[PDB]
A paper describes a structure:
[name] ([name]) gene encodes [name], a secreted cystine-knot like growth factor, distinct from the lipid-modified Wnt. Unlike Wnts which have promiscuous interactions with Fz receptors, [name] specifically binds to Fz4CRD, but not to the 14 other CRDs of Fz and secreted Frizzled-related protein (sFRP) family members. The [name] mediated pathway maintains the blood-retina and blood-brain barriers and regulates angiogenesis in the cochlea and uterus as well as neuroprotective effects on retinal neurons. Our crystallographic and solution studies further reveal that dimeric [name] forms a complex with two copies of monomeric Fz4CRD.
We determined three crystal structures of [name], using selenomethionine-labeled protein for phasing. The [name] protein fold is identical to that of the previously reported MBP-[name] crystal structure. Each [name] monomer comprises three β-hairpins (β1-β2, β3-β4 and β5-β6), a β7 strand at the C-terminus, and four intramolecular disulphide bonds. The two monomers assemble as an elongated, head-to-tail, dimer stabilized by three intermolecular disulphide bridges (Cys93-Cys95, Cys95-Cys93, and Cys131-Cys131), in agreement with small-angle X-ray scattering (SAXS) measurements which showed [name] dimer in solution. The dimer interface is further stabilized by extensive hydrogen bonds and hydrophobic interactions. Superposition of all molecules in the asymmetric units from our three crystal forms with the MBP-[name] structure showed an average root-mean-square (r.m.s.) deviation of 1.5 Å over 190 equivalent Cα atoms. On inspection the superpositions revealed a high degree of conformational plasticity in the β1-β2, β3-β4 and β5-β6 loops. The flexibility inherent in these regions is consistent with the relatively high crystallographic B factor values. Conversely, the structural comparisons underscore the conserved nature of the interface at the dimer core.
Numbering used by the authors:
A (entry chain A): 31 to 141
B (entry chain B): 35 to 133
C (entry chain H): 1 to 7
Amino acid sequence: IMDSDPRRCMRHHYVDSISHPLYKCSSKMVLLARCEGHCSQASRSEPLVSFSTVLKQPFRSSCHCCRPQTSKLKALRLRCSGGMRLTATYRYILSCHCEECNSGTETSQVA
Amino acid sequence: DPRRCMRHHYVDSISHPLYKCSSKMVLLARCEGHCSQASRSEPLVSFSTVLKQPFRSSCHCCRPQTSKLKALRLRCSGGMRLTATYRYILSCHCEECNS
Amino acid sequence: XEEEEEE
């Protein structure tokens, strides 16, 4: 049974202390996850052939990037000087995967 | 290291999308490899209740650094010679995904 | 597409 390459895309845990960069708030330690690794697929770039006007885009390319596949929204609550409470929002990455560079994730909701 | 970002040659057959034209086989360069820098993605923290940019990421892609624009004429039905353009890659390097 | 989902 072979262990796999450790340098591949996978998740890592780390701790950080959250503080507001302006308000005098009470800092707070939080457990976070990140993604990092070398995706297995090579990245490519090929020329495209045009018969029309010189192409605005002369290449077709593929490139895989280690990125969150699933995550979970989480809120944090900070206690600040005036007894005013300040809430911090972030995403806790659950799993990581290799996906295409140009692909993205929309935030805008649809009617 | 044969796996790194570099130039690879391959044959491509040039054909017009529409016109009956005498096909042309040409030797093209592509750039292909494994960039040494790991790709990564990080959570960003927002003090807003809205999270428009949830992550901070970095990714390197094997890409054209220098290239020649080359023209090629195709011999096409009716005695026409139609002209095609492509970029002949000269050098390739490892570049950040979203410039 | 290359692994982690946490108590």
